[PDB]
Amino acid sequence: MDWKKIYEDRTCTADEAVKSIKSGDRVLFAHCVAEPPVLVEAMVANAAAYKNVTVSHMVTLGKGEYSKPEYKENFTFEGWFTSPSTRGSIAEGHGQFVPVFFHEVPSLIRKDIFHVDVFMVMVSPPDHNGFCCVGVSSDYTMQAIKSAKIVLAEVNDQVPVVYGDTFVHVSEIDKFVETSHPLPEIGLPKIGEVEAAIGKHCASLIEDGSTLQLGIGAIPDAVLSQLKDKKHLGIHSEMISDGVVDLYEAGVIDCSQKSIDKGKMAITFLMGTKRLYDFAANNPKVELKPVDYINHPSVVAQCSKMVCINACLQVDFMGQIVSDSIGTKQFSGVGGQVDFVRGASMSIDGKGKAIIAMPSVAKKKDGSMISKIVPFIDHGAAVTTSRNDADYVVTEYGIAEMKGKSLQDRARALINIAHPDFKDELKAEFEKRFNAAFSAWSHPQFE
Template identity: 75%
Template sequence: MDWKELYESRTCTAEEAVQKIKSHDRVVLAHSVSEPYELVDAMVANAENYENVTVSQMVSLGKGEYTKAKYKGNFRYEGWFTSACTRECLAEGHGQFVPVYFHDVPRYIRTGIFPVDVAMVTLSTPDRNGFCSIGASCDFTWQAIKSAKVVLAEINDQAPVIYGETFVHVSEVDAFVETSRPLPELKLPEICEVEKAIGKNCASLIEDGATLQLGIGAIPDAVLSQLKDKKHLGIHSEMISDGVVDLYEAGVIDNSQKSIDKGKITVTFLMGTKKLYDFADRNPALEMKPVDYVNDPVVISQCSKMVCINSCLQVDFLGQVVSDTIGTRQFSGVGGQVDFVRGAAMSLDEQGKAIIAMPSIVKKKDGSMMSKIVPFIEKGAVVTTNRHDVDYIVTEYGIARMKGQTMQDRARALIGIAHPEFREELKEEFEKRFNTTF
């Protein structure tokens, strides 16, 4: 059958497509901005016909209706990351969180640790050869399509076509639902003086010709804003934001000195504004690859002058980094933090740097301040990056190097970059902890 005839024969409404989901299936949703919202809405609307359907995903920017208590007999959320719309069900006890390194997710899918009955994804309009791009999300989405028993695709004519390991033939999809909607956009963060200072401190650790991994938010954008005088930077990152576009167009990022994927911005998913999606669309300077390549510590170790920059919620005197829990409450997930921290540590050129950057304090709802540098991590919190892996900790007050330092020297360095209002209190705790003068 000609691919066009096949496509036409499998095109249907979202309501018809979700009839292919059966009770007790595991449904995997495409990641982040590629979540197929029309299919998800139709699945929720059909909830009364399901019993115990497991829904798995990482970051969701949708409504997360399937995690609501009223659907707990129909859907069971089993997330590999949590977002604002999905984390409440964990606290309520009818959702589950599965700890997993980002780079391991495709392998878990391939080997059946994470079985996939149904993959629901967003794809671009088919090209003249019948191939669709998986748009802004390759990561584990590509493997979910390859491994699923049933693939349901929302064909969005506004989804970008991105080069790399991103193409799926229409013959691999069981149902198509045609839509036309802009990709979700993240509001650009406001960069205040604290973030500017953190960005400047991080930038001081980045040399010309470095390969960078950055996340999203005010701190990564602040770092990028401080790199305008650098030369020949490269990108090997699980994701990028709009700030990378600005530096690429200014010639600061040219990927010319990358040791692997030379000349290319290498990512596994995108999350930003239309400016970023338009930049990536059919751009041969950017390649998207599965997360088991991009985030594999062995691959990262091959990147020249690798510098990874991630954030956290809390750091204790020993350098233990808490990034995904607040006490016993699951807040997010490990994501790619440990993948890149370890990859940088394993750098073949021995020039890798792993930076954990954060404001020195967090302001509570009542306006009071709490130090993010603490003697002990909060009860019930989980260590994300352990004390043996941690490298640099950066706040607006400076840089503390952890590697090669004793526990006491680590604590002294961290107190030195803590907020001034907490330093005396931290010094007292230091003397109690280590039975010595500060």
């Protein structure tokens, strides 16, 4: 109606739209799959128009061109979660990294700590009432829309309409750039015997009626594959994957025993194949909500029989968990790992569990093996899940309980699930670290 005039008046080309960015601006992209590639391309192509423009976002499936050293006078990448195409800049020094809990991002936007001069977002074209849909992200995207000084939208008719807090009226957007292209996809991972074993251990901790949080990759896919005997599972998760769709259509996940958002998979973003995007579209069983709801520890605490499944990179004898860095090298980010660990620990029913899982070993490129159960974290590594936060740790060799357990008993339990080849070296490190014998037993049979 009146809105159609607004929409038409504000429609332009991508090259025109990015002229609204000025030197010194803080620019933010919509999260993950909602990043607008045509707008990002235009901004990068217009690099010489800009001096010292901050570019922030979290995980990206895009090229991360603005993060390359040649652009360092034009753009400064400020990642809140890094990925293969942007992590190089952080290692090299011209890119920056902010450690921030995923649930807290909207708060930092509202507080103007994460000030947003220009927000760039991909959306569906408007419905009959002038509401566009973000489709695949709610997360921090919805707050950014409200708080940004200028919102630039790539209107892509391949974006799905998904229920929840995903809608933005055309009157809230400054410029529209019309496009049509498929959304980025991630492939399904290969599951090895190591991951299969991890999934089986994780599955043994999951009872009927559990509310699940899990991500993407071989580990959560392995877990899901081992849940086919379970009943009435629910979802309250930062994201769902293609794997969750499989378990839903197997009849295992039905959200019938949830305490809040009953009958619905409650999520904050989507990332997978087009099969996932199609599933989520116009589906009463799926609802996207902002990250300061979904990942809020006080909200997770209200979930029934919460089971949160997340991966790490290494765990030390004290139960310090490193998940986002290898020594001084930054790889990803905390994301929602600690949000859900905390929510499960705070669970009002007292039934919440947080599982942190990893292969027990890695093969280095020189051919040698290394233990991911370690006496000490790598030099300069960031602790992601602190020793006080730690709950269950799982490898292909079993389950170690950290919660309420002493440093010595944590180390004993971790060594017990370490690779057999490393156990003697690790027990020697135990004795040096703790000034105590590994074995708590002492049988008179052995003098």
